[model samples]
Target chain A: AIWRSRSFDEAIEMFRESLYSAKNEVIVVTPSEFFETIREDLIKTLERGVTVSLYIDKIPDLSEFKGKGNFFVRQFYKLNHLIGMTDGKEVVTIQNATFDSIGPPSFKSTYPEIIFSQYSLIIEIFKESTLEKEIIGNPKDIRFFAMFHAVDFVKNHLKNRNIYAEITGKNLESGRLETLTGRVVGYTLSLREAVNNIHLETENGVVKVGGMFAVIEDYESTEIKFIMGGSRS
Target chain B: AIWRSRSFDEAIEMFRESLYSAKNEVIVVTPSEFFETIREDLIKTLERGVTVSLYIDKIPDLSEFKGKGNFFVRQFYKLNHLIGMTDGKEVVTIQNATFDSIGPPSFKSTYPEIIFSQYSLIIEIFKESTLEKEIIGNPKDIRFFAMFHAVDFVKNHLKNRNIYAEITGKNLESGRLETLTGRVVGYTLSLREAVNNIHLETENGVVKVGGMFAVIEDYESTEIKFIMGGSRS
Candidate 1:
């Protein structure tokens, strides 16, 4: 079954309903702002013994859930879309949904958002997307490793391949919105292994990309985004 | 044979000699600045059909070595020490050496700086230290994995153990120096998978640790260094 909602209240209602209906688990990937709104619902779900996994861009005060056996949270430096799944069955994806509180919850400005699907493939993709490699030792090593892995992934799999990529995230340091789109030509992971600096060549020209991470989607046609910070040269 | 050098020239000479003497392979891990001084030596060594693997903190323009069959390079985000080994037989470590060129390469300020060793234990440590978990897939996923891995390692190996950590690396975004020290008290890697931030409680207090990697050493007494970026609160 698929459900669509234009009103913010209806969408949030659907989200809350999904939480209540969850049997075993709930997985969420979103900016911290969206989390702020659904925070209470999540706590109630955890209280019911449902496993909750949250992947948010900004670090939130998770003290409330600390030491809770079923609650798991990981912070990504940046994330664009909002994804939520309940019990590996029901899925909701919110695209370009804004929660700036500019108006009422059911205001017209928040129209044209929300998707409900029973599609297993989409759920599987989200699940796999959330599965990350094991980071041993220091956190920065993993950060550099992630940046390098991104560049290397592009170089080996996506470079010269016909694809389109759209990346949205925030600068790791400045926390400013960082976005980029490009025809994937090539990228260089510097010997220094820092994300703040990367050389990416697109159809337009060479772009200096930097950030904690980038969400890149490859279409049949090209792309890259840096989360922490990025620049074009 | 162990050789110690107080003079910069002598140290470079020993380094060059080791390169020439390599019968099979050479491994190096250093900052970009040092690579600039020894780039030619590395190229010549590669010309001899010797395998050369380099791990550096900054990415260097490797256009010249792009097609070389015997050379390989990997980049890590941050590294402080200068480590080199020749055919797994000779090892050289440079401490607190700087080549800013304010004066002669051997000005009094740059003295007392080199160690050459045949000790296998030191060689083993360097070799093991360079080993990193192979990174796969999208960058953010790996970043989370790395953070979790670091936490898990401490939980399994370093927790309640006597060890010292000295993390010295640049912030991934700002490139500013980030440092931290703590007697390991405790840490948590929430089931949530993200790298934007982490919770670690040291003997001092709650530390907000962020970075690419950290260097942790086990000592008779104790330390952990966060790479890329870190802070204690």
Candidate 2:
């Protein structure tokens, strides 16, 4: 069943509830001002390994947030409506009122079909929205995929962001652990078959990095830190 | 529950069942010779709008199959076993015996958790496999995303493939419908916030393309045909 928030406080409560209840990921779209009231709660949620994506009119000072966890903040101005979605299931949208004002109301639902009907729009908005100077991400915050799944990750997710890689892996020839950081340009797997490589463009030139049990590459990564749109690690 | 394919026909029949039962997508990995027996069934399934991805030792003559469906046939040379999956579920894998022989065995499972256990590896194989000259996709066959969701489609799916775009859209500045074919370089919307534009780099220069109800774009696309790594339309 769907629920309605009658008062301004009730609406904010529903929004915050969406945040706290998220098991994996959450997306919130509102004016930058709204973050001020719920900033601490958001950080705490991130501390628990939940991903938070914020779409606001202006980028906030994210320096207060620890430099880890997946934090995506994009800008979308002229937003008269504010919305929150948790793990693409729970949803709340307030279009006619401010979070602090008591004049307008909001509605929420915990239904999958209803939430999915808008999830694509949310993803589209996230895609079309800017990736601005809001890049304060740490390499450790980059999502990790074991070596076998890393090929698809690079193919689907890396092209859209400013990508960097720091690998605590092994050199194929030496059979020993090593570390290197570089700007990732492409992946060898996407180019051809046979367990492939991650094309990392380092300061010297290009290096081919592999994952666990890599057969043909310059290095096999054991631990990797991927940061989008960040400085060289 | 899990199942066992007792013999060769049972295994091949199970494989065909996986192909025919797909609702939207399928991924099959095996030697190239195996396609000879089930090619017609595969084509018929594609005719019914099921997307098929084949990973084999050699690319086959996909010419017989009509050119309006998404057919991705890649090359993976070292495959020892064969597997078939319908829409990422209902998996059947054969490790021994030929389709013509009555020896060896196979297994099938309809369980999601069991299937997903191998899904990432399947996807990894697909990604790491060679995207060879098996480019036989039509513009009409490319997946369609309404204007609002087109941005994400381009971001996630385009970069991995050899990319081309044919747009039957309208001019935002002018009033009439138009069309263009180009090698896609980037998107304007991804660069900044605001209802953004899709960057379709034409032969002359980069032009801004938009989706339905577009506000800022050189052309607003009503229909877009995107092919990965194909000649210009």
Candidate 3:
């Protein structure tokens, strides 16, 4: 007998009941933002002798925040997404609920309008997901363990590497916004310098940056232009 | 027993012996020049009920020839190369011998030249001569007559009326010696006219025309040019 969930609450209920079931392992792979929201439940699963794996990309640069207490958690979250293991055999992929919200317009009519509609074609994507190879349940599976250990391994391998920059968004002019402050350091700094040199002004409370450069808009249009310099020359 | 021949005289002797022993039919296909040279022998073979087939790309304009006494020979040669009749059982394919000669230039030259040597290949190609629904005698039999008839039938059924022209020796200046003069015409006169308009030149002793167009040629520092009138507008 099997049970499934329509909501997050229902999923939590089903998971809790399945703990004593005859399943060997569970796996979850998802983004860091989503992992941050449910860190407690995942830690509980790890404590239950289940193999838990998480993959996230990019590590933040924090001067005072360095050598922090949750160094292991930071290592775990450095992977691209998450793959969780419950017991030694059963596996599940944990995905995030993508919810977009549009707020009310202001008196000056400055609120950006967003069209929200679920496309029917998106359901077809589920077919490809179903057709993919199911992860093996071998207890000695190196690929399974490698996915769990990828972050710490990569960090140790790339210490002092020149290609990857240690990024903290405080170096950017947009660092005035606290939430977006520590996203990425050098890249945001370069983008800010380019936008500043352009000397373009936007309406109050609105800002726009160059989108595409040195690329054809469509097949027919001929006039070629680049928004950034190095892209063309 | 089949006897092989290394020389022309030996070949004729073997052919004469085969004629005495032949129980059913014989087929011979040869080049147009060979057939013209051996017309008397071929006529005797045809009179003896041996099927004779010849393949030539060009039928010479026989209007300037001598007497009408050879009219039967001319008619049979024309019908063999162009269109002929047959009951469905007997068929053959006769082709011109393609001879290619290659040597170092009589004058001093730097590079060795290559020729395809198509004579042996052309002679080696053979198809059924005497056709039955199921051939019995020798499975290795080459039915030249049956193949020629089959090809003629296919051409009769599927020949398109599209016009074409071919030009030979088309790259010589008016001042040069040994220029070629000729335009091959088929179906319509328009293609011949087009070829003449595109590439037409006469040298010391020959006419040169109808090649892919080129504008300039240099000889020891002297430049020569040819002009073309493409379109009115």
Candidate 4:
């Protein structure tokens, strides 16, 4: 359909047809496990409102790209080659070009001096990597939970505030372990918004929290803390 | 450009945009594990020569859909709903509907009496299921390896042959396990053929061989037998 920019012998099908021809952003780096085996093309490129950022080491299974998109993961552990970028005019490197390549010899680009020289070395490799803040549930869900806890989880709690968290784990009931004190009102997206279920306002009421394995939520935490505090929550 | 047959409030994004709009044929029936989470869209729909058929209950991990396409797997265990039919116009069903459904309420059809009434009840649920043959290496690499060893590993060797296997397993060297018989004759297909590395031949010479945990191959088997004489090869 007059869709140019060719040559994809299969760097994983040119990374799922350039993440279904992304519109906003996607920057996968890849150290392998092929991003938890392309969880349904990274949740439809985060439901087509793309903004994926995975450098890769293995922190996948972020419960189906939470609420379907707004991805960011960085524990890269110094991975090599293999890359993917979509938008500002597509780009792909896939250096180890032998994942199944006859020599696949990767190279997917669209000029603009190779898309701003691979988006200026992948934006300084996302500022020498490390931008994973965990949680991508909607804003397209702000479309912007923005910049990721300033990557340092704000030290001095400086200025603008909107703190909320009081998560205590093992919400099993009789197998013991239970203390789901909370402050996140209601949020449940899944039936295809991908996943993110938080409704814990417990004094003993709206506990439908899940993140990792919180089926139908009764309580399942990865541990949390915020009321304007943090020793670790 | 025009393409319409919509209504994918996400049954996993209409099972991945109907497996990237399959061409000839594709049929999936999910029992979840969601087919080990879509191995790069089932090896690029068996490298776009399509003919995929899966019935579910977990089997996946077939080393990147061997030689890049020709799929067949049947172990339904009477799995329900969650369908994906491509060619014959298209079909989706996804009943449990709530794998993240806000009542995602699936329905991906193109009419023609809902694609021949869901392809005449999915070709009688693939003749009441069970056509799994295990193997789909190139054939466009036959464009036809044809209807699965006739659904019954061919009793009484009925005509047109071409059998080859001698797979004895556990090919370790020092920590024990050996016995590498022979047969297969040079196949090697990675670097992006998806994967399938045979070669064998033995009696001392070509070895290659791989299939699950077979990094760069030398000898690895899930056990095999065929020079034909099967009592169990």
* Candidate maximizing TM-score: 2
Report lDDT (Cα) of residue B42, candidate 2.
75
In order, the B-chain TM-scores come to 0.44, 0.58, 0.27, 0.32
Q: How many backbone clashes does every candidate have?
A: 42, 4, 42, 22
Docking class of 2: incorrect
lDDT of 1 at A221: 9
| Interface RMSD of every predicted model, in angstroms | 22.4, 15.8, 36.7, 17.9
Off by over 4 Å in 3: A15-27, A46-51, A57-83, A93-96, A100-233, B1-233
Displacement of the residue B132 alpha carbon in candidate 3, Å: 54
State the lDDT of candidate 1 residue by residue for A161-194, as single tens digits.
4333444435434546645564444555533322
Better of 3 and 4 by DockQ: 4
Error of 4 at B158 (Å): 20
- In the range A92-142, model 4's lDDT, one tens digit per residue, is 665433233344335665533334334433433443456554444443121
Q: What local lDDT does model 3 show for residue A81?
A: 16
Q: State the local distance difference test value for candidate 1.
A: 0.43
Model 4 TM-score, all chains together: 0.33
List per-prediction Cα lDDT, in the order shown.
Answer: 0.43, 0.61, 0.24, 0.50
Residue-level error in angstroms, candidate 4, position B195: 3.8
Summarize candidate 2's per-residue lDDT along B5-97 as a digit string, tens digits.
Answer: 557778888888778777655667776767787788778777776666677887777778656466766786644457786754477776523
- 1 or 3, which is superior by TM-score? 1
Model 2 C-alpha lDDT per residue in residues A1-233, reported as the tens digit of each score: 46776576787888888788876556777767677877887787677666666778788888777565666677765344467877655778664343235645467876433343344235334433565533334444553323433454467667677677777777767878877888788886533233456789887689888753354578866366666674434
Candidate 2 segments exceeding 4 Å error: A1-233, B66-68, B97-101, B134-138, B141-233
List ranges where model 4 is wrong by over 4 Å: A1-27, A32-52, A55-195, A200-233, B1-27, B32-162, B165-194, B200-233
Which candidate wins on DockQ?
2
